Scaffold this active site. Structure first.
Site, mmCIF file in Angstrom:
data_model
loop_
_atom_site.group_PDB
_atom_site.id
_atom_site.type_symbol
_atom_site.label_atom_id
_atom_site.label_comp_id
_atom_site.label_asym_id
_atom_site.label_seq_id
_atom_site.Cartn_x
_atom_site.Cartn_y
_atom_site.Cartn_z
ATOM 1 N N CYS A 1 1.196 -6.687 15.999
ATOM 2 C CA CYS A 1 0.403 -5.667 16.687
ATOM 3 C C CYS A 1 -1.082 -5.919 16.434
ATOM 4 O O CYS A 1 -1.531 -5.928 15.288
ATOM 5 C CB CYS A 1 0.789 -4.257 16.226
ATOM 6 S SG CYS A 1 2.529 -3.818 16.500
ATOM 7 N N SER B 1 9.233 5.457 10.849
ATOM 8 C CA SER B 1 8.434 5.077 12.002
ATOM 9 C C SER B 1 8.771 3.638 12.389
ATOM 10 O O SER B 1 8.930 2.786 11.520
ATOM 11 C CB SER B 1 6.954 5.200 11.649
ATOM 12 O OG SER B 1 6.121 4.699 12.664
ATOM 13 N N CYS C 1 -4.718 0.892 7.490
ATOM 14 C CA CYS C 1 -3.448 0.373 6.971
ATOM 15 C C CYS C 1 -3.432 -1.126 6.796
ATOM 16 O O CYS C 1 -3.617 -1.873 7.759
ATOM 17 C CB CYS C 1 -2.328 0.801 7.924
ATOM 18 S SG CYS C 1 -0.737 0.561 7.200
ATOM 19 N N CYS D 1 -3.247 -3.656 14.343
ATOM 20 C CA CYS D 1 -2.750 -3.458 12.974
ATOM 21 C C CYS D 1 -3.242 -4.574 12.050
ATOM 22 O O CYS D 1 -3.074 -5.755 12.350
ATOM 23 C CB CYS D 1 -1.215 -3.383 12.966
ATOM 24 S SG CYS D 1 -0.417 -3.129 11.332
ATOM 25 N N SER E 1 6.357 4.237 17.390
ATOM 26 C CA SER E 1 5.036 3.701 17.671
ATOM 27 C C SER E 1 4.970 3.153 19.099
ATOM 28 O O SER E 1 5.272 1.982 19.352
ATOM 29 C CB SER E 1 4.675 2.632 16.640
ATOM 30 O OG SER E 1 4.510 3.241 15.372
ATOM 31 N N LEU E 2 4.561 4.022 20.021
ATOM 32 C CA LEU E 2 4.569 3.722 21.448
ATOM 33 C C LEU E 2 3.275 3.055 21.939
ATOM 34 O O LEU E 2 3.322 1.952 22.479
ATOM 35 C CB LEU E 2 4.890 4.990 22.248
ATOM 36 C CG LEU E 2 5.173 4.891 23.753
ATOM 37 C CD1 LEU E 2 6.268 3.881 24.091
ATOM 38 C CD2 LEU E 2 5.531 6.266 24.291
ATOM 39 N N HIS E 3 2.140 3.746 21.782
ATOM 40 C CA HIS E 3 0.796 3.171 21.973
ATOM 41 C C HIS E 3 0.423 2.678 23.378
ATOM 42 O O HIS E 3 -0.658 2.118 23.564
ATOM 43 C CB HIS E 3 0.546 2.049 20.952
ATOM 44 C CG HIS E 3 0.858 2.440 19.543
ATOM 45 N ND1 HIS E 3 0.464 3.643 19.004
ATOM 46 C CD2 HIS E 3 1.518 1.783 18.560
ATOM 47 C CE1 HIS E 3 0.868 3.715 17.751
ATOM 48 N NE2 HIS E 3 1.499 2.594 17.452
ATOM 49 N N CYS F 1 2.800 8.124 2.206
ATOM 50 C CA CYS F 1 3.039 7.011 3.106
ATOM 51 C C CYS F 1 3.429 5.787 2.282
ATOM 52 O O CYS F 1 2.707 5.395 1.360
ATOM 53 C CB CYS F 1 1.785 6.737 3.929
ATOM 54 S SG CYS F 1 2.027 5.472 5.162
ATOM 55 N N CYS G 1 3.970 -8.112 7.854
ATOM 56 C CA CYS G 1 4.818 -7.782 8.998
ATOM 57 C C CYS G 1 4.752 -8.922 9.995
ATOM 58 O O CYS G 1 3.688 -9.505 10.197
ATOM 59 C CB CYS G 1 4.345 -6.493 9.674
ATOM 60 S SG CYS G 1 5.445 -5.885 10.991
ATOM 61 N N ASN H 1 -8.125 3.380 13.394
ATOM 62 C CA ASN H 1 -8.920 3.101 12.203
ATOM 63 C C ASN H 1 -9.390 1.646 12.199
ATOM 64 O O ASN H 1 -8.584 0.721 12.011
ATOM 65 C CB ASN H 1 -8.135 3.434 10.929
ATOM 66 C CG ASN H 1 -7.762 4.905 10.844
ATOM 67 O OD1 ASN H 1 -8.513 5.774 11.291
ATOM 68 N ND2 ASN H 1 -6.595 5.190 10.275
ATOM 69 N N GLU I 1 0.808 -1.209 0.000
ATOM 70 C CA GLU I 1 0.000 0.000 0.000
ATOM 71 C C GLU I 1 0.844 1.263 0.000
ATOM 72 O O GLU I 1 1.873 1.338 0.670
ATOM 73 C CB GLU I 1 -0.916 0.022 1.216
ATOM 74 C CG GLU I 1 -2.121 -0.888 1.090
ATOM 75 C CD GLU I 1 -2.947 -0.924 2.347
ATOM 76 O OE1 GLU I 1 -2.661 -0.139 3.286
ATOM 77 O OE2 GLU I 1 -3.889 -1.740 2.397
ATOM 78 N N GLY J 1 4.657 -3.096 7.097
ATOM 79 C CA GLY J 1 5.986 -3.583 7.458
ATOM 80 C C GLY J 1 6.725 -2.726 8.468
ATOM 81 O O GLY J 1 6.407 -1.547 8.662
ATOM 82 N N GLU J 2 7.718 -3.337 9.107
ATOM 83 C CA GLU J 2 8.602 -2.666 10.046
ATOM 84 C C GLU J 2 9.901 -2.303 9.317
ATOM 85 O O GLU J 2 10.669 -3.191 8.941
ATOM 86 C CB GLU J 2 8.865 -3.572 11.270
ATOM 87 C CG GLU J 2 9.927 -3.073 12.262
ATOM 88 C CD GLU J 2 9.693 -1.641 12.728
ATOM 89 O OE1 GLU J 2 8.584 -1.332 13.216
ATOM 90 O OE2 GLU J 2 10.628 -0.822 12.606
HETATM 91 C C1 SAM Z 1 1.709 0.431 9.855
HETATM 92 S S1 SAM Z 1 3.042 1.005 10.930
HETATM 93 C C2 SAM Z 1 4.516 0.863 9.890
HETATM 94 C C3 SAM Z 1 5.811 1.354 10.533
HETATM 95 C C4 SAM Z 1 6.243 0.613 11.803
HETATM 96 N N1 SAM Z 1 6.001 -0.857 11.675
HETATM 97 C C5 SAM Z 1 5.529 1.194 13.021
HETATM 98 O O1 SAM Z 1 4.735 0.522 13.672
HETATM 99 O O2 SAM Z 1 5.708 2.359 13.373
HETATM 100 C C6 SAM Z 1 2.814 2.805 10.909
HETATM 101 C C7 SAM Z 1 1.863 3.325 11.978
HETATM 102 O O3 SAM Z 1 0.542 2.949 11.658
HETATM 103 C C8 SAM Z 1 -0.159 2.668 12.852
HETATM 104 N N2 SAM Z 1 -1.361 1.847 12.594
HETATM 105 C C9 SAM Z 1 -1.420 0.557 12.135
HETATM 106 N N3 SAM Z 1 -2.718 0.198 12.021
HETATM 107 C C10 SAM Z 1 -3.486 1.241 12.404
HETATM 108 C C11 SAM Z 1 -4.863 1.417 12.479
HETATM 109 N N4 SAM Z 1 -5.685 0.428 12.135
HETATM 110 N N5 SAM Z 1 -5.372 2.626 12.917
HETATM 111 C C12 SAM Z 1 -4.522 3.660 13.268
HETATM 112 N N6 SAM Z 1 -3.156 3.477 13.186
HETATM 113 C C13 SAM Z 1 -2.646 2.286 12.765
HETATM 114 C C14 SAM Z 1 0.874 2.040 13.767
HETATM 115 O O4 SAM Z 1 0.531 2.326 15.096
HETATM 116 C C15 SAM Z 1 2.150 2.759 13.362
HETATM 117 O O5 SAM Z 1 2.407 3.821 14.249
HETATM 118 S S1 SF4 Z 2 2.013 -1.481 13.526
HETATM 119 FE FE1 SF4 Z 2 4.008 -1.618 12.510
HETATM 120 S S2 SF4 Z 2 5.164 -3.126 13.716
HETATM 121 FE FE2 SF4 Z 2 3.023 -3.406 14.260
HETATM 122 S S3 SF4 Z 2 2.255 -5.181 12.870
HETATM 123 FE FE3 SF4 Z 2 1.693 -3.151 11.910
HETATM 124 S S4 SF4 Z 2 3.339 -2.736 10.465
HETATM 125 FE FE4 SF4 Z 2 4.106 -4.322 11.967
#
Ligand code: SAM
Ligand code: SF4
Length: 359
Positions: free
Chosen positions: A113, A195, A339, A116, A217-219, A102, A109, A296, A89, A163-164
Site C-alpha cells: 500500500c 483490520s 504507522c 503505508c 481497509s477500503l480506501h 494498537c 508487510c 498521516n 510498533e 502487517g496484514e
Molecule cells: C497499518 S494497517 C494494518 C492492518 C491491515 N494490514 C489493514 O490494512 O487494515 C491498519 C490501518 O492503518 C492505515 N494506515 C497505514 N498507514 C497510514 C497512514 N500513513 N496514515 C493513515 N492511516 C494509515 C491503513 O489504511 C489501515 O487501515
Molecule cells: S496498510 Fe495494511 S495491508 Fe497495506 S502495506 Fe500497510 S500494513 Fe500492509
C-alpha cells in the site's frame, strides 16, 4: 523453556497436564500473567512451591521489550518493541471512557500500500503468539495491570499495527483468543478488532476460527482507484471483498451486523465529492459504519494529506445517503504518529549489533 505467552488457555491446560498438574492451575497462572502482568513465578504467592519449581525449570514468561517510547501531550504512547533482531510498533491511545491498544501482526508487510510506511520496508517475518499477545502484556504492565491499579489498562484492542493480520492467522487467532479470555485480558469480542486490506480466502477462514469485530481497509470507491492505492485489490477486487465481508457477518456477531469501514483521505486521490457519491452507491448493499482517517504523512510518500474541508464535504455527502460516518481524530500529533515510522529502516539492524558491543 516454553514461553507461556505462546499458549492459549486450551494449550496452557494441556501443558500443565503434561507437568502432572490439574487444568485449573493453568488458569491460575494465566490470571497471574495477565491480570497482574507477572513474569516471575516467585511472585505467584498462591501457587504451591512444587508447581513453582516445575515452572521455573521448563517455562518462562518472556514478553517483547520496549526499545523506544514516545509520549504525546494528548496521552498517546507509542512504543518500538524488540522482536528478535527486529522492531514492531505498539500504540496506546487513552480516552476518558476508553483505552485502545494498537498491536502489530507482522514485521513489515508484503502488500505494498503506497500510503503505508510499512509497505516500503517489505515483509520480513510473521510474529509469534508471544510477540503479539506480548505487546498487550507489555503495554498493560507499563500502563498498569488491572489488579495492580484497580483499573483495566486496556479496554479495546485493534490489530492495526504493522502487517496484514489475515496473513498471520496461525498466530493472530490464538493471541486474540487470549485477549478475549476471562483469564487473559477479559475483553468483549466487540472490543477486539481485526483490520484487513482484504485477503479474501483468509477472511473466510477467520470466520470459522473466531468471532471478533472486523474492520476493512477500503480506501477507494472503485477498482481502478483501489488497484493503485491498495494493490491486493488486483487479486481480490471490491465486490469479492464485500461478498466475503457479508459471509463473515453471517458467522460473527461482534460487529453487531455492521462492518467498520476504514477510509484514508488522500489529497485529490480518493477524497473528492465524486468519490463520496461512488462510495455511497458502492456500499448500498453492505451495512456499515464509515471511519474517515486523515492520512498521516511520512517522508517520501507519493501522497498529500486531504484538507479538513475536503474531508468534511466528503463526510457530508456520505451522511446525506444516511451512512453513519465518523472523522477520526489524529492522535499523538506531536510525536511520530505515522504507522511503521518508529520501527523504521531495517538497515539500522547492523548498527544495533555494534551498539550493544559498546554497552
Ligand atoms: C497499518 S494497517 C494494518 C492492518 C491491515 N494490514 C489493514 O490494512 O487494515 C491498519 C490501518 O492503518 C492505515 N494506515 C497505514 N498507514 C497510514 C497512514 N500513513 N496514515 C493513515 N492511516 C494509515 C491503513 O489504511 C489501515 O487501515
Ligand atoms: S496498510 Fe495494511 S495491508 Fe497495506 S502495506 Fe500497510 S500494513 Fe500492509
Amino acid at each position: 523453556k516454553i514461553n507461556l505467552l505462546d499458549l492459549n488457555r486450551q494449550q496452557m491446560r494441556e501443558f500443565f497436564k503434561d507437568l502432572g498438574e490439574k487444568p485449573f492451575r493453568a488458569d491460575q497462572v494465566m490470571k497471574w500473567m495477565y491480570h497482574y502482568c507477572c513474569d516471575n513465578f516467585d511472585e505467584m504467592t498462591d501457587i504451591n512451591k512444587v508447581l513453582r519449581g516445575k515452572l521455573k525449570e521448563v517455562a518462562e514468561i518472556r514478553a517483547p521489550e520496549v526499545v523506544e517510547e514516545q509520549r504525546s501531550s494528548d496521552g498517546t504512547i507509542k512504543w518500538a518493541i524488540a522482536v528478535g533482531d527486529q522492531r514492531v510498533e505498539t500504540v496506546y491511545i487513552p480516552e476518558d471512557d476508553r483505552a485502545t491498544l494498537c498491536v502489530s501482526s507482522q514485521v513489515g508487510c508484503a502488500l505494498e500500500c503506497k500510503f503505508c510506511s510499512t509497505a516500503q520496508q517489505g515483509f520480513n517475518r510473521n510474529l509469534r503468539v508471544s510477540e503479539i499477545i506480548g505487546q498487550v502484556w507489555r503495554a498493560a504492565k507499563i500502563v498498569g495491570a488491572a489488579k495492580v491499579t484497580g483499573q483495566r489498562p486496556i479496554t479495546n484492542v485493534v490489530m492495526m499495527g504493522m502487517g496484514e493480520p489475515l496473513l498471520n492467522l496461525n498466530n493472530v487467532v490464538p493471541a486474540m483468543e487470549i485477549m478475549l479470555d476471562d483469564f487473559g485480558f477479559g475483553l468483549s469480542k466487540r472490543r477486539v478488532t481485526l483490520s484487513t486490506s482484504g485477503v479474501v480466502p483468509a477472511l473466510d477462514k477467520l470466520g470459522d476460527m473466531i468471532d471478533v469485530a472486523l474492520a476493512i481497509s477500503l480506501h477507494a470507491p472503485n477498482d481502478e482507484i483501489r488497484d493503485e492505492i491498495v494493490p491486493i485489490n488486483k487479486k481480490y477486487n471490491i465486490e469479492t471483498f464485500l461478498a466475503a465481508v457479508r459471509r463473515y457477518l453471517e458467522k460473527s456477531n461482534a460487529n453487531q451486523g455492521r462492518v467498520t469501514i476504514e477510509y484514508v483521505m488522500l489529497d485529490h486521490v480518493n477524497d473528492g465529492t465524486e468519490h463520496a457519491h461512488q462510495l455511497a452507491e458502492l456500499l448500498k448493499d453492505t451495512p456499515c459504519k464509515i471511519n474517515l482517517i486523515p492520512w498521516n504523512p511520512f517522508p517520501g510518500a507519493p501522497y498529500g494529506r486531504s484538507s479538513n474541508s475536503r474531508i468534511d464535504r466528503f463526510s457530508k455527502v456520505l451522511m446525506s445517503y444516511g451512512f453513519t460516518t465518523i472523522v477520526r481524530k489524529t492522535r499523538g500529533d506531536d510525536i511520530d504518529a505515522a504507522c511503521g515510522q518508529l520501527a523504521g529502516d531495517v538497515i539500522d539492524r547492523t548498527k544495533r549489533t555494534l551498539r550493544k558491543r559498546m554497552q
